[PDB]
C-alpha cells in the first residue's frame, strides 16, 4: 500500500485535475512529432505529464509524495518555459495549477 499522502495525490489531486475541462492536453507526454521538434526536447530537459504521473501512482513508482509533487511542478513549469503568456495552453495550465496548490495545501499527515 502507498503512503496516505500518495493515495491523496492519486484519489484527490489527480482525480480532481483529470476531470477539469482544461486538463486534456496534459493527459499524455507532449508528442513533438505529432505536433517534428522540433525544438521541444531541445529546451524541455525533463518532460512530464499527468498521464505519466497517474501511471506512476497506479504502478507504485513513488517512494514519497514529494516526488509526485515535484513531477507536477515540472509539468506546469515546462508548459510555461515553452509557451508565451498569452497562449491558450498557459491559461489552461494556470487554472490547473491553482487547483493543484489548493489541494496540496490540504494534504493529510502520515500517521
Ligand atoms: Na508520502
Distance 71 CA to ligand 1 centre (A): 14
Q: Which residue has the cell 509524495?
A: 65
Resolution in A: 1.4
Distance 61 CA to ligand 1 centre (A): 12
Distance 63 CA to ligand 1 centre (A): 7
Distance 90 CA to ligand 1 centre (A): 29
Distance 23 CA to ligand 1 centre (A): 24
Helix, strand, coil tally for the chain in percent (to 5): 60, 0, 40
Axis-axis angle for helices 65-82, 50-58 (nearest 10) = 170
Helix (H, G, I), strand (E, B) or coil at 15: helix
- Please name which of 7, 15, 20, 12 lies closest in space to residue 96, comparing C-alpha atoms: 20
For the CA atoms of 99, 86, 26, 1, what is the dihedral angle to 10 degrees?
-30
Q: Which CATH topology does 3-108 take?
A: Histone Acetyltransferase; Chain A (1.20.920)
19: its cell numbers: 476531470
Amino acid at each position: 500500500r502507498k503512503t496516505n499522502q500518495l493515495q491523496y495525490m492519486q484519489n484527490v489531486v489527480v482525480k480532481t485535475l483529470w476531470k477539469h475541462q482544461f486538463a486534456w492536453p496534459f493527459y499524455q507526454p507532449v508528442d513533438a512529432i505529432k505536433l517534428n521538434l522540433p525544438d521541444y526536447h531541445k529546451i524541455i530537459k525533463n518532460p512530464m505529464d499527468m498521464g505519466t504521473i497517474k501511471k506512476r501512482l497506479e504502478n507504485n513508482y513513488y517512494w514519497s509524495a514529494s516526488e509526485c509533487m515535484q513531477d507536477f511542478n515540472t509539468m506546469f513549469t515546462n508548459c510555461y518555459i515553452y509557451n508565451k503568456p498569452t497562449d491558450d495552453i498557459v491559461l489552461m495550465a494556470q487554472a490547473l495549477e491553482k487547483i493543484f496548490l489548493q489541494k496540496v495545501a490540504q494534504m493529510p499527515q502520515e500517521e
